[PDB]
Design a protein that fits this description.
The structure is cut from a larger assembly and holds one copy of chain A (about 325 residues), one copy of chain B (about 160 residues), two copies of chain C, one copy of chain D (about 50 residues) and one copy of chain F (about 100 residues). Chain A is an alpha/beta fold and about 325 residues long. Chain A is built from eleven helices and ten strands. In chain A, a hairpin with a 2-residue loop joins strand 9 and strand 10. Classes of the chains: A alpha/beta (about 325), B mainly alpha (about 160), C mainly alpha (about 90), D mainly alpha (about 50), F mainly alpha (about 100). Chains in contact: A-B, A-C, A-D, B-C, B-D, B-E, C-E, D-E, D-F.
């Protein structure tokens, strides 16, 4: 039985440990969960599961495990009651260089002081060039992942990618530069699969995402306040905090579930566990878990308290899910 | 009439983009239109668009129209209020209760701010009423509704 | 400004997030990655010194910056003892 | 032809001309509070009025 | 003398009036800005709201 | 409000040959008093005496009052002129 660690700083994660453990034991999978902390997690562990991370904790974990991007997945909108967005087969991708490095924003002609200024300028040149190369590499990683995702997705002859780009700050400038570079550079998988990439503004992008997310397949956002806002918008539109399954990739894959302070819906974390099991190979067990979730939401309809419609407790909901699985 | 409603149906269903770098919004659409949006839209649908095509596509068209109407009703709110102050984080069904909660809470906070800055509870309440009435008048919002809201916040304080 | 607006534009300075917090752990990770990048162009002795530095940073990471803060306190104590001795004419 | 011309005459797909904006004439109090920042904010206001 | 400009800036900022204006601006910033003209010309209230924010 | 009046005065002096009077420059100076522009005010005060016209001290004192107010208030010039320039030459830094 493998030992996949499981970071949980809060009582919510501490109880969801036992919850997901009961679920997994009823699902009969040959793996196990090891309670750890975000600051003492063990390296050389590629596939992981986790809980709602704070911003600083996401930055720390990304710097630890070499992460570059965060993906979302709103599959639970089909299960949401009175669903305004059934079968929301799109994906949002957000870069992470702000959380990984918040400080990225930042004499009479004697033969001595000018030399000192030259050396200081060389030092700052080296530093800023390294940081700029790292940011450019993270942005290239995000964009390459989004392109590979748009290509891997079942193309409806449209394959649309929206990219938020409020003109201004250095992050947006870099993002414009790398989008231009990739587009004018590769263009071949893009033009062959007919992947229509479009940089747009926030005020012109998020209403499109709201009204018609059918016209879009992939969304890309930098680590600005605007990108965080669009990500939280999608995280809510997928069924509220708790229902969407978040993911974090780079040099290693970890799964998460978004949740505010007062929320307790673990369906995002259950979908995260299912995605993890599909990644490792236990697709039958992931399908069992998904069928159990669907049975909980449709046959018994035992919805959690925070959600509209029916109302029930976290632990009773997890008991229903486990009994449905087994 | 029929022309503008067909343009509206095309914009809602997404078969057409609007004739500039402009977004679709309740404000940015009802401003063009005559402020009889939903009633005349549904009436024109049921009159001239439903009986033409078969019931099979008619059901899905009515469905999609209700979805897009709800989505524009959600679009009415601002992005910052939606995300940061937590109007949407629970969900569409809870947008209304969360808006009411945020409104009452921010009203109580503004009232406490005015009383801490000025004291003189009568003066503070008067200034709060003036501010609320002016913001309602600027947001095209009923003055009776604003006065009732202000009295409600004062009672709940 | 068409449409009956649902909510009023009300804001409180308390509701406005004013944290301005300051992180050290990600800065140390960035330093470690920069040193790792610099290690490739290093000579033998410089490579050994940078390896010792990387080991020191890893020790800070495992100690959760406690040894780092201890060294900071040591240096600050050295400076604080250094200042009043140089006041030749207090 | 009259009906066709009347329907063609108006651009429902387009956006109407908003009322014009007179000069700002910023106040001395706000300027004393924010000397150097109102220029950046006005530039951002132009940027948002054009794009957003 | 780099600190003499800073001393002048200190003499400028160190006033009671500027703090009174801050005290009455943050509590009632609607007075300063031309909000009726902004809401009149502006087609999206999100612009005016982000302007005040 | 000033440019229309001084275009009427250009239409007066240049086009039609008529020349303004103390009443005309009085209406001109009242506008600059209301607008608070003390520099254009001082221009009008100087132009009067260069043409023999004499201002009203009720307006001269209001001009000097606006001048003293903007002096003490720092509004003697706009703020965008009283801020440092880019030490490094850059087409974006200078704002063009």
């Amino acid at each position: 039985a493998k030992t996949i660690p499981f970071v949980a700083s809060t009582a919510l994660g501490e109880r969801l440990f036992a919850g997901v453990q009961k679920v997994l034991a009823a699902a009969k999978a040959p793996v196990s969960l090891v309670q750890t902390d975000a600051k003492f997690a063990p390296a050389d562990a590629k596939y992981l599961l986790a809980e709602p991370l704070s911003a600083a904790a996401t930055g720390e974990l990304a710097n630890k495990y070499g992460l570059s991007s965060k993906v979302t997945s709103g599959a639970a909108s089909q299960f949401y009651p009175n669903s305004i967005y059934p079968s929301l087969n799109v994906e949002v991708v957000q870069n992470l260089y702000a959380l990984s490095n918040p400080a990225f924003s930042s004499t009479v002609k004697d033969e001595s002081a000018i030399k000192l200024a030259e050396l200081q300028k060389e030092t700052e040149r080296n530093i800023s060039s390294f940081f700029r190369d790292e940011a450019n590499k993270s942005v290239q990683a995000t964009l390459r992942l989004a392109c590979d995702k748009a290509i891997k997705t079942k193309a409806d002859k449209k394959t649309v990618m929206v990219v938020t780009k409020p003109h201004g700050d250095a992050f947006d400038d870099l993002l414009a530069q790398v989008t231009k570079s990739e587009s004018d550079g590769r263009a071949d998988e893009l033009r062959n699969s007919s992947v229509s990439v479009e940089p747009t503004l926030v005020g012109n992008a998020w209403p499109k995402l709201v009204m018609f997310p059918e016209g879009v397949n992939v969304v890309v956002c930098g680590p600005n306040a605007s990108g965080d806002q669009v990500a939280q918008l999608f995280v809510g539109i997928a069924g509220g905090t708790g229902m969407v399954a978040q993911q974090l990739v780079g040099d290693a894959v970890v799964f998460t579930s978004a949740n505010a302070e007062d929320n307790e819906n673990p369906t995002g974390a259950l979908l995260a566990a299912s995605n993890l099991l599909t990644a490792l190979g236990h697709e039958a067990e992931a399908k069992k878990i998904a069928a159990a979730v669907a049975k909980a939401y449709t046959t018994d309809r035992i919805l959690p308290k925070e959600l509209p419609g029916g109302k029930a407790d976290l632990e009773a909901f997890i008991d229903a899910v486990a009994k449905h699985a087994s | 009439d029929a022309v503008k409603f067909q343009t509206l149906y095309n914009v809602l269903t997404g078969k057409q983009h609007l004739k500039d770098q402009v977004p679709v919004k309740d404000c940015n659409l009802t401003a063009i239109f005559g402020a009889s949006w939903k009633a005349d839209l549904n009436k024109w649908f049921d009159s001239e668009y439903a009986p033409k095509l078969p019931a099979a596509e008619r059901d899905s068209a009515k469905k999609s129209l209700d979805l897009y109407l709800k989505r524009v009703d959600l679009t009415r709110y601002t992005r910052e209020e939606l995300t940061t102050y937590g109007i949407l984080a629970c969900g569409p069904g809870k947008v209304d209760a969360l808006t009411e909660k945020h409104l009452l809470e921010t009203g109580k906070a503004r009232l406490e701010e005015l009383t801490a800055g000025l004291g003189n509870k009568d003066e503070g309440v008067n200034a709060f009423r003036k501010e609320v009435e002016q913001e309602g008048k600027y947001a095209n919002w009923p003055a009776e509704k604003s006065k009732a809201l202000a009295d409600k916040v004062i009672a709940a304080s | 400004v068409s449409g009956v607006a649902p909510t009023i534009y009300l804001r409180s300075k308390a509701a406005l997030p004013a944290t301005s917090t300051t992180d050290v752990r990600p800065q140390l990770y960035a330093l470690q990655r920069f040193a790792k990048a610099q290690l490739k162009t290093a000579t033998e002795a410089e490579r050994a010194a940078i390896e010792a530095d990387i080991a020191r940073y890893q020790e800070y990471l495992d100690s959760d910056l406690e040894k780092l803060k201890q060294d900071v306190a040591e240096d600050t104590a050295k400076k604080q003892k250094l200042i009043p001795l140089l006041d030749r004419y207090p | 032809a009259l009906a066709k011309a009347s329907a063609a005459q108006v651009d429902w797909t387009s956006l109407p001309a908003a009322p014009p904006r007179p000069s700002p004439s910023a106040p001395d109090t706000l300027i004393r509070l924010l000397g150097s920042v109102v220029d950046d904010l006005a530039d951002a206001d132009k940027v948002e009025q054009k794009y957003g | 003398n780099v600190y003499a400009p800073m001393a002048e800036k200190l003499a400028l900022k160190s006033n009671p009036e500027l703090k009174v204006l801050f005290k009455e601006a943050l509590l009632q910033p609607a007075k300063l800005l031309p909000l009726d003209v902004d809401y009149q010309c502006s087609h999206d209230r999100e612009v005016v709201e982000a302007k005040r924010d | 409000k000033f440019a229309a009046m001084m275009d009427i005065l250009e239409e007066m002096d240049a086009r039609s040959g008529i020349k303004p009077n103390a009443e005309s420059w009085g209406y001109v100076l009242k506008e600059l008093v209301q607008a608070g522009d003390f520099r254009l005010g001082w221009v009008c005060i100087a132009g009067m005496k260069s043409l023999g016209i004499t201002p009203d001290q009720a307006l001269v004192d209001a001009n000097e009052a606006n001048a003293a107010k903007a002096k003490a208030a720092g509004t003697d010039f706009p703020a965008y002129l009283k801020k440092a320039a880019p030490e490094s030459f850059d087409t974006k830094a200078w704002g063009i």
